[PDB]
Amino acid sequence: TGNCSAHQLCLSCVNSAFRCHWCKYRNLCTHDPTTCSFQEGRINVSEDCPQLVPTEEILIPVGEVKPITLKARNLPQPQSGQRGYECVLSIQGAVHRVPALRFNSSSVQCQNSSYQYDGMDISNLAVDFAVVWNGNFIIDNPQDLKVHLYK
Ligand SMILES: *[C@@H]1O[C@H](CO)[C@@H](O)[C@H](O)[C@H]1NC(C)=O
Ligand SMILES: *[C@@H]1O[C@H](CO)[C@@H](O)[C@H](O)[C@H]1NC(C)=O
Ligand SMILES: *[C@@H]1O[C@H](CO)[C@@H](O)[C@H](O)[C@H]1NC(C)=O
Ligand SMILES: [Cl-]
Ligand code: NA
Ligand code: NA
């Protein structure tokens, strides 16, 4: 027994021993699935959670306008008034937000941007990033995927 609400993302939530459900449009974990917005928002097992899936090295050359195309599963369609998708990258301690597009439930793309980083001897920089929607609803990234900027 415990507060399902303490789980911050879907995968932790549905894997809880507390017996919890994830509300994908409200972005919260609950013991009572009736607190989700509607039935289709209720996630009960990990395979149904929104998540990025394993992919080969995401390689973006510095100083060139490029999109970043990410493979996923179960990405939610925003409800009325909810904001869409963004990529949030931490590059050497600074946060960059890039507009993104959900092409479908299995594909999200950070839209065209150029990227830079400091360091003449770093030929390939691993960058922490999140895909979010509605400002701060984070998509689970269980394989710990990184963006790799390269020189
Ligand atoms: C924790 O769960 C109890 C129900 O067992 C509830 O009364 C309380 O509001 C919950 N707290 C939070 C912060 O969700
Ligand atoms: C993205 O940027 C490249 C390079 O500037 C450009 O050639 C391409 O047309 C752009 N694509 C979109 C969809 O804006
Ligand atoms: C999802 O969108 C991408 C990009 O447009 C496309 O390549 C892919 O085939 C789509 N997948 C499905 C199942 O529609
Ligand atoms: Cl919901
Ligand atoms: Na969500
Ligand atoms: Na992942």
Author numbering: 653 to 803
Paper text:
Class A plexins (PlxnAs) act as semaphorin receptors and control diverse aspects of nervous system development and plasticity, ranging from axon guidance and neuron migration to synaptic organization. Plexins are large type 1 transmembrane proteins comprising typically ten domains in their extracellular segment, a single membrane spanning region that is predicted to be helical and a conserved, cytoplasmic region that contains a GTPase-activating protein (GAP) domain with a Rho GTPase-binding domain insert. All our PlxnA ectodomain structures show autoinhibitory, intermolecular “head-to-stalk” (domain 1 to domain 4-5) interactions, which are confirmed by biophysical assays, live cell fluorescence microscopy, and cell-based and neuronal growth cone collapse assays. This work reveals a 2-fold role of the PlxnA ectodomains: imposing a pre-signaling autoinhibitory separation for the cytoplasmic domains via intermolecular head-to-stalk interactions and supporting dimerization-based PlxnA activation upon ligand binding.
All our PlxnA full ectodomain crystal structures have an intermolecular plexin–plexin interface in common. This interface is formed by blades 1–3 of the sema domain of one plexin molecule and the outer side of domains 4-5 (PSI2-IPT2) from the ring of a second plexin. The residues in this interface are conserved among vertebrate PlxnAs but much less among all plexins, suggesting that this plexin–plexin interaction may be an important functional feature of PlxnAs. We engineered two separate segments consisting of the PlxnA2 sema-PSI1 domains (PlxnA21-2) and the PSI2-IPT2 domains (PlxnA24-5); each segment encompasses one side of the putative “head-to-stalk” intermolecular interface. We found that PlxnA21-2 and PlxnA24-5 associated with an equilibrium dissociation constant (Kd) of 20.9 ± 0.38 μM. Taken together, the results of our in solution assays point to a head-to-stalk mode of interaction between receptor ectodomains that is common to all PlxnAs.
